[PDB]
Write a protein that binds this ligand. Structure first.
Ligand SMILES: Cc1cc2nc3c(=O)[nH]c(=O)nc-3n(C[C@H](O)[C@H](O)[C@H](O)COP(=O)(O)OP(=O)(O)OC[C@H]3O[C@@H](n4cnc5c(N)ncnc54)[C@H](O)[C@@H]3O)c2cc1C
Ligand SMILES: Cc1cc2nc3c(=O)[nH]c(=O)nc-3n(C[C@H](O)[C@H](O)[C@H](O)COP(=O)(O)OP(=O)(O)OC[C@H]3O[C@@H](n4cnc5c(N)ncnc54)[C@H](O)[C@@H]3O)c2cc1C
Lengths: 391, 391
């Protein structure tokens, strides 16, 4: 079989890229290792930037989002017995963020792709990339025991952190920057109304806690935990008790608890690879970088990578300007490093780090007091949170 | 002998406090371990905040400063082959900083004190504090072999980092926060015109460099060096060569070099003690806290401590409101921690740290790119640099 753009991965990056290209008349095939069900089971993201919201509209998949998404104008940070609200809207110059589950976005894209008739191969096993530096690269995979070959012009590696694409680039061509945090986030999804109409990030002596939501009757909560913890050691009962201990009293008493629909631990890490391309292979999303969830940037960076790749591919196909593709990495990395810096900052001021001396603890506390008390300080948080401009 | 306020230390803190109190009619005695000459030999500070400038006027010692000081409206940061100017004036809402040597400020204060006839005892050896928690504390010292006693109501410890005052407070009453940096600043004072009309802080792969000044014909330069260095290993020739290697080409070629009037190494440290008082003893300046020189806050924090102590002492004596003195520490510490956080931030983004991984190096570079490229980011630097409001 042959196509123009082969896409490895049917997570949000691959689906979004596939939809945008399909609409512009550029044929693409998506190869996914898992089943549609497995992909739909991943909870993940809840916060979307306006740029991503606009990209969904451009891809014509925003109906359900416009109806069901919750536009947030502010966010709250609680520390040392204080609760400070950051008016994102006022401080960023009118921008806001939208709360809409990653599961929902993925479902919308999958339904749109299914309807268009564009090619998608689930359970595509043993994907291998070939002749990346040639003019005719190809992808081989197994479907029901038989090895098939897919010829194409370009390959978009949208296969996440553990994908085959980043592994297909000669190791000596890549420079990796990585940082592993000494903690993870234990998350719990409950069919209960959220404790607040806005998100609450809490810095507490026992560790970080976050009150988020999915809708008016579905909440998502997180608590920082050591990497040595096992989810089976955390009953719903223990989670609720611990969550309450980390929140302000007035917030903790209005908390409606309930059984969990989902519970899991996500370890925190930062990861960046430079460059993000090799010959005809271009990496996008988690395949090229990981950000700790504290700043809500992961999916949102996947969106800007895809927006950039789609626009460069359009010029290559429609305008015959293939030279512009060499610029992909430089353009993406500028935004990636700034989002990484913000996600790192947020993580360092909201979490409890093991083996922290007295000086560092005081500085951490003073960072919050200063940034949340100064108009200039609040503005740096707000502009980064709503998301920096796309290039 | 008897006095109202005994002041330990004739550095800028003690002299400034002594002058303000004398003018308000509150008698004070200053005890200094060294000679006037030794004190005058310390180069130190070059940058003053507006609050300190205003306090000098209030103390009636601003003539020479108003004539000789240089008002700066901006400052420059050079990194990765770029030179970025921070318009302090525009970004802070009209505030600026004044460049006037600490040696000059000290000389002005010493001449003013000498003229007023207020008591100052130089070469006051073996100073000891007594009955701090009593209603009648006293100070003993030796002058020309004979031990004298000085009775007083209050004692102001303005004796710097190695003073006797902080050592006179029961160790279990104090909580110390400290951080030692793995480098020092090798400074050089030259009788040459400065390379720029504004300061240049430079982050370079070889390490930090700073281009400062004292007047139109006297410059002060610094380069970051390991703590294992000896000033005798650094000839003027080696210093100039190294300085040039760390500055942008265009700046390095306009550099007028010359023999040094003074050369010394200052190690970098952060130090805070809580509280800053014990009974009738109140600590001010370096006796209570040390900030790395990167943010130019040391002398400037000494000024706000003194301004607060003077105003509280005025109410105690003039208005009989002695209870207000219990508030000294809380008021000072709020400003101290914010200046410490800024001095720490400045130090971490401008210096080369040993054993820094690739991720940290990129984040350091991105911090500069973001803060110097965003209006909100530039404003946080500017408002902190000109100095946060006095309480
Ligand atoms: C707890 C948590 C909270 C988060 N919160 C937020 C938030 O609020 N906002 C935000 O912006 N981000 C958030 N993120 C991040 C966001 O979820 C991710 O960045 C996003 O999933 C990345 O999308 P992707 O398509 O690049 O990769 P993925 O979602 O990992 O999808 C990659 C796909 O490729 C498939 N694949 C893998 N290997 C192969 C192969 N060899 N062959 C073929 N197919 C393969 C995989 O099965 C998968 O379907 C959060 C993440 C977590 C863990
Ligand atoms: C390289 C460098 C650059 C700097 N640059 C700046 C700048 O640009 N701007 C800024 O704000 N700050 C700067 N600082 C800091 C500033 O110099 C100090 O914070 C300031 O000297 C503190 O004043 P002080 O009076 O509290 O203490 P000091 O200046 O140390 O004076 C204390 C006095 O007490 C005396 N004393 C000591 N022990 C006793 C005793 N036992 N009995 C009696 N007398 C005693 C000492 O001899 C001394 O005279 C810089 C510092 C350095 C090292």
């Amino acid at each position: 079989m042959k196509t123009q753009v082969a896409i490895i991965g049917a997570g949000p990056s691959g689906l979004l890229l596939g939809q945008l290209l399909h609409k512009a008349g550029i044929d693409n095939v998506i190869l996914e290792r898992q089943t549609p069900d497995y992909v739909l089971g991943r909870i993940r993201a809840g916060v979307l930037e306006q740029g991503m919201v606009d990209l969904l509209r451009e891809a014509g998949v925003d109906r359900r989002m416009a109806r069901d998404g919750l536009v947030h104008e502010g966010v709250e940070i609680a520390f040392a017995g204080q609760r400070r609200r950051i008016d994102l809207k006022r401080l960023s110059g009118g921008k806001t963020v939208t709360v809409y589950g990653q599961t929902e976005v993925t479902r919308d894209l999958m339904e749109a792709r299914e309807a268009s008739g564009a090619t998608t191969v689930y359970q595509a096993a043993e994907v291998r990339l070939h002749d990346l530096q040639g003019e005719r690269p190809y992808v081989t995979f197994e479907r029901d025991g038989e090895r098939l070959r897919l010829d194409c012009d370009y390959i978009a590696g949208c296969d996440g952190f553990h994908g085959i694409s980043r592994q297909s680039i000669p190791a000596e061509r890549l420079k990796v920057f990585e940082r592993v945090y000494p903690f993870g986030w234990l998350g719990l999804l409950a069919d209960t109304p959220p404790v607040s109409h806005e998100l609450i990030y809490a810095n507490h002596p026992r560790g970080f806690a976050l009150c988020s939501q999915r809708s008016a009757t579905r909440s998502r909560y997180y608590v920082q935990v050591p990497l040595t913890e096992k989810v089976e050691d955390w009953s719903d009962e223990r989670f609720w008790t611990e969550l309450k201990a980390r929140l302000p009293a007035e917030v903790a008493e209005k908390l409606v608890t309930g059984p969990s629909l989902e519970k899991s631990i996500a370890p925190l890490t930062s990861f960046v690879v430079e460059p993000m391309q090799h010959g005809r292979l271009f990496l996008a999303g988690d395949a090229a970088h990981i950000v700790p969830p504290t700043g809500a940037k992961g999916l949102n960076l996947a969106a800007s990578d895809v927006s950039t790749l789609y626009r460069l591919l359009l010029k290559a196909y429609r305008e015959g300007r293939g030279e512009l593709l060499e610029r992909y990495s430089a353009i993406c990395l500028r935004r990636i490093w700034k989002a990484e810096r913000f996600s790192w900052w947020m993580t360092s001021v909201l979490h409890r780090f093991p083996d922290t001396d007295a000086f560092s603890q005081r500085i951490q506390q003073t960072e919050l007091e200063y940034y949340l008390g100064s108009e200039a300080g609040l503005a740096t948080i707000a502009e980064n949170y709503v998301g920096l401009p796309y290039e």
